[PDB]
């Protein structure tokens, strides 16, 4: 089956590590710290990696039943999966997929209902991914929330994730470092690959969204390694991968005229030929398209 | 020549095309007593996006734009922009923004805002009743009640995240109501450039829905929300735009580990699927089984029934 990369532009596209649309595309260093995501991680013959599921909408998405933390207005959350069924701390992955890759305060709505009546309520809600109460390996996370008794026991509660807040600029939230998926008591395990150029002259390009800010001074780049469009069409075709670079090329379909190309590895990322940040700048009907396999050592024209 | 193909994905791996929120089952009823016209989630089997569809799931229901006080009051008005936060186009010929809501309900969510001088940001529960006279999104506005009467700021980028969607009164689950589309431009006009109405015209078929629950965020709401296609179908035929070689195509759900077929529908090529069913009924169906394309054929098709 012949490889292809789908032909939506990016802006048609999805941020594959929050519920948001991507906005543009951005190249930069990367040597200086680790680069290992674990939402939108797919190989590019469609292999799942590290907490990636299917769409975006799920991301950073929680579910479960709640009880209260003593008479406070902080909440535990004991998960379950998408549709309410068990999540399993024993499957070999970090966390359950969909589970925030970053340490960072995220701000949205904690809703339930009753299921005896169809009374419902929703409350402003955060979950700070660097407590030590953000376990959701072990099946937990908890909540602070505006309300320290309008939630229910034993009823299907969601939080929908809206944006990012911070306290003390822009040092939070630090997209590049994961959460402790255990707290304290256990280490990362069965992490997606850190990532990184191997080619000199080469740098990372990244699919990059801006994630509201709900209060303070947030960091709020969000850059992805594959828009969430990509991973869902990796995982359909599963189409073999003939060598571990695919050269592609992105096109601007107005003219025909290729704008820059780049290296889709096999293990799922990209690199482009360029030295140092750069905001990329894409026409909007701008495209990337799968021309050929080649090699790790294949040199790209600058970008 | 391109063969047509739907995608593989099951249905609890897709997305709701009418708020972003996943999949949840396949259902068949009764749409008698309804006009079913959404316009998210409108797509032909060739690709042409209709109504007010676009190609992600993260963008329906969102808003975004500059907002002014009501007054005195805790309402606001949002003076709408495109999703890259360009200037919004109201001589466009489409119903309202892609992504607008296509229903009369409550929908509740968190407005936000950032301070582009010095990157200060802010966040408000709101809700935007797209029932109400001041939900003009065709006109370029629609108004949020929230919880504040004094924290945003004028001349600042703010958008609107929908979470959910709200009720009142006591006749409990009266609202939303998914099958009645908004007055894009109010009272001002009628609204144009509608993807048209649906129905079941064979005799013994109706429409086979995409079902989610949208959250409830107070009182006791209508959460039931049904989609035509599921928006990784919208995709999918947005970028293969595979030629309709007939009027209809016609659709097994197959479960894969048997290789048996469940059932067969007709995915008609204007983007919507009935079945040979008569009432209502959650289809029993395996998690990993999912639609496959097997051939081209007419709207007189006489199906096995469900
Ligand atoms: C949780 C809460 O009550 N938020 C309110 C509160 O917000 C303040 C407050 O949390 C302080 C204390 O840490 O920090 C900020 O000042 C925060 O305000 C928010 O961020 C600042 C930088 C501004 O951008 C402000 O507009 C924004 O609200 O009080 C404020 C009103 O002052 C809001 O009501 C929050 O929702
Ligand atoms: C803004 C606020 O203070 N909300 C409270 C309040 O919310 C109520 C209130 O808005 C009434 C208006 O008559 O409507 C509901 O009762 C609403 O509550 C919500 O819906 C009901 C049916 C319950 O499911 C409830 O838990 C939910 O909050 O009062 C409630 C307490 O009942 C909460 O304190 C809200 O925060």
Known sequence: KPFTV??????????????????????????????????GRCTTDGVLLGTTQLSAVNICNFRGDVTRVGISHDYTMNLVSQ?????????????????????????????????????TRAHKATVSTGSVHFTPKLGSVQFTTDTNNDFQTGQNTKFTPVGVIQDGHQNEPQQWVLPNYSGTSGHNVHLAPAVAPT???????????????????????????????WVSHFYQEAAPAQSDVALLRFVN????????????????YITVAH??????????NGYFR??????????????
Not at 12 to 35: C, D, H, Q, W
Not at 212 to 227: A, K
Not at 253 to 268: I, M, W, Y
């Open 199 to 229: 080619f000199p002259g080469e740098q990372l390009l990244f699919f990059r969204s801006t994630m509201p800010g709900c209060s303070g001074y947030p960091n709020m780049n969000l850059d992805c390694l594959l828009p969430q469009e």
């Open 290 to 303: 799968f021309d050929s396999w080649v090699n790790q050592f294949y040199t790209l024209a600058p970008m």
């Open 275 to 284: 030295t140092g940040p750069y905001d990329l700048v894409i026409p909007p």
């Open 253 to 268: 379909p107005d003219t025909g005229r290729v704008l820059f190309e780049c290296k889709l590895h096999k293990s799922g």
């Open 83 to 119: 549709n309410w069924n068990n999540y399993d701390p024993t499957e070999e992955i970090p966390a359950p997929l969909g589970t925030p890759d970053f340490v960072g305060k995220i701000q949205g709505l904690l809703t339930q209902t009753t299921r005896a009546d169809g009374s």
């Open 6 to 39: 789908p032909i939506l532009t990016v802006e048609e596209m999805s941020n594959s590590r929050f519920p948001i649309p991507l906005e543009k595309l951005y190249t930069g260093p990367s040597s200086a710290f680790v680069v290992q995501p674990q939402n």
